Design a protein around this ligand. Sequence first.
Ligand SMILES: *S(=O)(=O)Oc1ccc(-c2c(-c3cccc(OC)c3)ncn2CC#C)cc1
Ligand SMILES: *S(=O)(=O)Oc1ccc(-c2c(-c3cccc(OC)c3)ncn2CC#C)cc1
Ligand SMILES: *S(=O)(=O)Oc1ccc(-c2c(-c3cccc(OC)c3)ncn2CC#C)cc1
Ligand SMILES: *S(=O)(=O)Oc1ccc(-c2c(-c3cccc(OC)c3)ncn2CC#C)cc1
Ligand SMILES: *S(=O)(=O)Oc1ccc(-c2c(-c3cccc(OC)c3)ncn2CC#C)cc1
Ligand SMILES: *S(=O)(=O)Oc1ccc(-c2c(-c3cccc(OC)c3)ncn2CC#C)cc1
Lengths: 149, 150, 149, 149, 150, 149
Amino acid sequence: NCERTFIAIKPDGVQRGLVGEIIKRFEQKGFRLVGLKFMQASEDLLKEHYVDLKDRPFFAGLVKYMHSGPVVAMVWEGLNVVKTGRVMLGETNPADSKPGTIRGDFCIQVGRNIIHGSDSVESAEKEIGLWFHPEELVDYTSCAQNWIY
Amino acid sequence: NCERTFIAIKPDGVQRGLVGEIIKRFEQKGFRLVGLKFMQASEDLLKEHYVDLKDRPFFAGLVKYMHSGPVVAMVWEGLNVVKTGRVMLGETNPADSKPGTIRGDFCIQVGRNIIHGSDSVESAEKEIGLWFHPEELVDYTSCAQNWIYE
Amino acid sequence: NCERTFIAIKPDGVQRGLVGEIIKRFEQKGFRLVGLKFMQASEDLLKEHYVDLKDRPFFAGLVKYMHSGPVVAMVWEGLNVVKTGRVMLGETNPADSKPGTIRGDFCIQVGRNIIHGSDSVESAEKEIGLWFHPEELVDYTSCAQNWIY
Amino acid sequence: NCERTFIAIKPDGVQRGLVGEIIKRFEQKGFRLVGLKFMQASEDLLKEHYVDLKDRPFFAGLVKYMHSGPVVAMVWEGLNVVKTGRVMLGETNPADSKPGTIRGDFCIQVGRNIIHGSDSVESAEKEIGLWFHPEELVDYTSCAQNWIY
Amino acid sequence: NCERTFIAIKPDGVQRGLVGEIIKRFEQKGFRLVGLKFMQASEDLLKEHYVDLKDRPFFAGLVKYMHSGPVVAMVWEGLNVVKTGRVMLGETNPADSKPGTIRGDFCIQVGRNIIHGSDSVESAEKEIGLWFHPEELVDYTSCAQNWIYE
Amino acid sequence: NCERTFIAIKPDGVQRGLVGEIIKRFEQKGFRLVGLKFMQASEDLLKEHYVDLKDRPFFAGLVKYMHSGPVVAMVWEGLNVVKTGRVMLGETNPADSKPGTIRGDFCIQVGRNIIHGSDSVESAEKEIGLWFHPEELVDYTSCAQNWIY
Ligand SMILES: *S(=O)(=O)Oc1ccc(-c2c(-c3cccc(OC)c3)ncn2CC#C)cc1
Ligand SMILES: *S(=O)(=O)Oc1ccc(-c2c(-c3cccc(OC)c3)ncn2CC#C)cc1
Ligand SMILES: *S(=O)(=O)Oc1ccc(-c2c(-c3cccc(OC)c3)ncn2CC#C)cc1
Ligand SMILES: *S(=O)(=O)Oc1ccc(-c2c(-c3cccc(OC)c3)ncn2CC#C)cc1
Ligand SMILES: *S(=O)(=O)Oc1ccc(-c2c(-c3cccc(OC)c3)ncn2CC#C)cc1
Ligand SMILES: *S(=O)(=O)Oc1ccc(-c2c(-c3cccc(OC)c3)ncn2CC#C)cc1
């Protein structure tokens, strides 16, 4: 219920003008915006973030693509926000993503797939700690909370 | 082909500002608005409406939640409007609801799931009769009818 | 602040599928929905409602047009809802209506201008009393009230 | 990656005002508009286009429906545009079509299902050649190409 | 009600993905789509089209910009479609264009102002004749005509 | 045309779910997102920011309202972004704001007017320096730059 997930709008997402469109979907869904910042990620940050993919054939090109422009880093709160957030994003490969999902509606190739979401609560807490100082995560009550829960 | 279903935007749906957004989806889909009204439902109306759920652990809290604010009661007409309407709403639990559906796009918890739709033609006719007098259901021809149905 | 206006989506507005679109604009603006109903208006109701236009050349045709299909009658509440509501509708003649307004965005000819709004607080209270029984007007507090006022 | 599909907005789609709405979905997805034209299709064109359905009970009525008003014929380019285009359209019967898809969002009956897409690369090249002269298909580079691929 | 205007989405408009968005505004307004085509315009066509601006300092660069990519050429029909179309586009300089208008919502600099509309009925008929063969302009009745015009 | 302006989404704007909607308008207009962050502003920051309004009757209540929840602070770049940004916001009092503008579309009372924009280039550079460290302002080229200018 106070669960948190880390959502990152990739450089292609920013370049193609989907920041507002993506944020809008999390807002209208009911989730609470906890953190938000706009930054060019360093390669050391990206390598730690994508560490499970370290020895994959695409990993070099992934780190380059993600360093190439700025990203919108975000933190969203709510019941099953990690799982439901992943569903809203759609499948990691946009080829598999359904219409209605962010990737399904807005992108084509896996190498340029506009958005990242945390795969689990464990990954979420690691990625949140990695991308944000705790001082940057804002605590407040949504005025619509009693109508969402 | 002029089958009818009952749709009710719950109090959280009204409070969160989704009335127009929800109605828009039925309009752009092609279905015809037959009835529409804004009312605070009494507990006797809600208890009859949700009578199949009478002896469920949540039933007391459901009736309270639904009494707490006003609802937009509606009646929509068209081919398989009951079944297709249910699909557009998405799964009753928003956790299962797909993006693209009303619940999937706009709500999180099952207890605050913004909208009701009739589960069958049998339930639809019972719920329509329950929520509307027959005088309130307007009959007219959509100007786009020949481009929606053959 | 507890001021009310009467808004009515004309038959062409209902026929062309603008009910949700119109309602959405009042919702997102911040105004509170007080009353809403869907009815075929009788000629005696329409003649009383448009009584100031009784002896105009179009009046007969206006009353027929408004009787021809159903209308969505509404009541909205908020600070200067009558004046601001009129602004959102745009000029009565759509030829004069600005893009951004309901008539400006959605209709062309004055004879088929999709929506009515009350011109003043006086007209509003007369039109509300005329179209609604007092039992049909619902009283409640918006959860966003402290962020609107 | 330079694959093309043929997309036709049927007469009901044009009549109901979905041309912009449909085109918008292909644009925001990332696909490149290659060809676009507005024409009343002849019965010989329609009979050749729907030749695989020649001896079906609905075929006469299909050809009539498609001749009844104008259509927006289109050609779109991109990676798996034929397959993904089909997915975006949704199932041919709107009864089966999912919310989020064009047919799922915008139509009800199979006989009036607003849009056609090519079922395969083979059908696409036949349908493109059938509906367009090669001079009408415009070649250019999307400014967002490096962020789509 | 049978008046026609020539609307054209410039190359920047096509490149930035506003074709559907622009067309949508004319559709939802009530105007009838009469002609539509996607073409790279030749310099002789553009020079004839912008002939009143022939001896302006920007004219060379205008013709180049308009030749650089494809355009969506269109023809729309309805009551005061030329005047109202111009209003919907907004002021030619986007700096002056109001929010709600196409240029006001979607572009910044006058040199890249995404759309053209005919300034008058006279210009409209010249521009329509210039950009379209008469066989390409489709005639039909909108199913919503009786709800748009009396 | 490398002007920057400071735009801030007030607490009511965040609470009512307009962050994506507001950002979308700047994106689709053509302006480049330079900085973005989500923070609860301190009273010393707000008092310095609204220093020209220091001795106004509402100033105490303004500072309280702006401290009450978090804000989305932003920096946008482009030709006349300060002036055009102000136009897109609409008049400071929503009563005067036109439909089509952010305040005109989304809010009612001056005390809860959802968004701030810089009034001039001078104020913009002061407000940017005040709300952002220079390290937080990201520099990059829009892929659509040659089609915007
Ligand atoms: S995002 O969080 O989805 O980031 C991301 C991770 C992994 C992939 C990927 C790729 C791939 C292919 C071509 C080029 C790439 O980067 C330039 C990446 N292939 C498979 N996966 C999914 C996995 C695991 C893309 C994006
Ligand atoms: S709506 O028409 O879906 O109304 C509604 C009916 C049933 C449920 C429900 C619940 C549930 C859980 C927690 C709290 C509740 O109300 C306060 C209700 N659990 C399962 N269902 C679906 C069934 C059967 C919610 C809403
Ligand atoms: S609604 O409130 O817009 O109702 C309404 C009132 C008055 C007019 C109108 C007409 C006119 C012209 C042609 C046909 C008509 O009805 C069939 C009406 N001419 C001027 N006005 C504006 C005024 C006062 C239309 C609609
Ligand atoms: S479009 O490409 O969707 O065109 C189209 C092709 C086939 C069908 C169709 C029909 C059907 C039913 C009733 C009336 C019709 O036309 C007037 C067509 N039944 C099945 N299919 C799909 C197949 C195979 C509809 C539209
Ligand atoms: S379109 O119809 O908007 O075509 C068009 C005509 C005139 C202008 C224009 C310019 C200008 C400035 C810099 C560069 C240009 O083209 C590359 C054009 N300056 C004033 N106007 C408006 C007039 C008259 C732009 C576009
Ligand atoms: S923002 O930049 O829009 O901040 C802002 C500044 C000033 C006003 C304002 C007020 C006013 C009235 C009642 C309550 C207030 O704050 C709680 C503020 N009265 C006039 N202005 C216009 C100016 C400047 C509102 C918002």
